[PDB]
Design a protein around this ligand. Structure first.
Ligand SMILES: Nc1ncnc2c1ncn2[C@@H]1O[C@H](CSCc2ccc(-c3ccccc3)c(C(=O)O)c2)[C@@H](O)[C@H]1O
Ligand SMILES: [Zn+2]
Ligand SMILES: [Zn+2]
Lengths: 115, 298
């Protein structure tokens, strides 16, 4: 029943006061984009940075298996938008947050489906 | 220097026509740095400006475009250049990248290993190479044409580049190859392009635009590299990141360029003219299959 839990290990290293994963690939873009979370091209709005997806995926970056049956990555080959105030830790952000399945924004960071 | 608002500077045609002898490269602005936008890597800025310049050429952009990117890994195990290529190329473009060292990538498929172990069944529409051997910068021995990965690259162009396809191959003062220059004469047009962000470096991208498969002009590769160094030595390029701030027209324009399969005997002067204008790709359109040769030992 043993499985490595890297998500939990990273969250705990962050809480311990560890330096977040660096060298996430930040893109140049207009910053007039839709602001959605994970897109086929950079979509950062005025409050977001856009990064190359693979460089922000914990499983990609650590060379470990993706936690799902067929091991698919939903960041690789896409761009992930990160609020500018959290862009110092894109990996942590994507791991600790969730995408609204209806509007495509980050829940709590642009998703307005609950007001 | 209205050049500072361009993505970079291309080698003027009058310098291509010279017959200079090879001198040491000595750049006036050597050691200056452009100031990059906050938190932007050199490799992202550099590939952005490369793509911005390529937007001004007659690149063939077919449906289901095929792009292969050599030398794509970084020292930190990611692929910034590939990420700019994915951003630039039309959605759905098949992008394959490769490097000697392990890295994680946004490309559709990645091969790890020396490029000489890379084989593909299909032909490609655009070949990008950032490969560079840092051992090559030995200032105390003569600067002769280098082989290594350049031998692979010339063969790869000749065998696996679609007619009408294009290339961009990084060179420097000491990392260069006479046959690659001579191959530039097999395209409808060619240049050496220096990005404004890295203009303090002798690096350039040798760009071949619209491959024709036959010599259109004869080019002496030893002379042409000497011409390139002469141009660089006498034409200081002001470092600049200006173009990085306007990305509104960055994406490569979807041209829907026609793909045809043709045998060597039916490529007339009329087809050659279509190729030369970026309006025709000649290759099959089967499945894209790639592999890496693995040597087995104890
Ligand atoms: N035969 C081959 N087959 C497959 N892959 C190959 C092959 N040969 C090379 N490579 C791969 O080329 C990729 C890019 S060259 C790495 C590089 C070079 C120079 C500088 C540099 C030097 C001086 C001043 C400023 C920058 C830097 C850097 O910015 O630190 C990085 C690497 O990842 C290499 O593994
Ligand atoms: Zn991943
Ligand atoms: Zn929502």
């Amino acid at each position: 029943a043993f499985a490595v839990d890297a998500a939990k290990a990273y969250k705990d290293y962050l809480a311990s006061g560890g330096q977040p994963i660096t060298n996430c690939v930040k893109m140049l873009c207009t910053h007039t984009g839709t602001g959605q979370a994970i897109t086929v091209t950079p979509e950062a709005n005025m409050d977001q940075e856009s990064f190359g997806g693979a460089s922000c995926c914990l499983y990609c970056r650590c060379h470990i298996d993706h936690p799902n049956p067929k091991g698919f990555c939903d960041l690789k080959g896409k761009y992930v938008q990160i609020p500018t105030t959290c862009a110092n830790d894109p990996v942590g952000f994507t791991l600790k947050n969730t995408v609204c399945t209806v509007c495509g924004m980050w829940k709590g960071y642009g998703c307005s489906c609950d007001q | 220097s209205s050049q500072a608002w361009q993505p970079g500077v291309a080698m003027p045609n009058l310098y291509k026509m010279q017959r200079m002898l090879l001198e040491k490269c000595d750049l006036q602005n050597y050691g200056d740095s452009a100031t990059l936008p906050k938190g932007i890597m050199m490799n992202v800025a550099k590939y952005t400006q490369l793509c911005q310049y390529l937007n001004t050429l007659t690149l063939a952009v077919p449906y289901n475009m095929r792009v292969i990117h050599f030398g794509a890994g970084s020292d930190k195990g990611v692929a910034p250049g590939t990420a700019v290529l994915r951003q630039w190329l039309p959605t759905g473009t098949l992008l394959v990248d490769s490097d000697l060292n392990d890295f994680v990538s946004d490309a559709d498929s990645t091969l790890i290993g020396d490029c000489a172990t890379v084989h593909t069944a299909n032909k490609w529409d655009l070949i990008i190479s950032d490969m560079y051997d840092p051992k090559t910068k030995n200032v105390t021995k003569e600067n002769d044409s280098k082989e290594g990965f350049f031998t692979y690259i010339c063969g790869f162009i000749q065998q696996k580049l679609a007619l009408g396809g294009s290339v961009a191959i990084k060179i420097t003062e000491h990392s260069w190859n006479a046959d690659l220059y001579k191959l530039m004469g097999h395209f409808a047009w060619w240049t050496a392009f220096v990005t404004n962000v890295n203009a303090s470096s002798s690096e350039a991208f040798l760009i071949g635009c619209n491959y024709l498969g036959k010599p259109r002009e004869q080019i002496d590769g030893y002379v042409m590299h000497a011409n390139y160094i002469f141009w660089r030595n006498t034409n200081p390029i002001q470092l600049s990141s200006y173009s990085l701030f306007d990305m509104s027209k960055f994406p490569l324009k979807l041209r829907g360029t026609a793909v045809m399969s043709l045998k060597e005997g039916q490529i007339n002067d009329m087809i050659l003219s279509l190729l030369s204008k970026g309006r025709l790709i000649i290759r099959e359109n089967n499945r894209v299959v790639i592999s890496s040769d693995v040597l087995v030992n104890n």
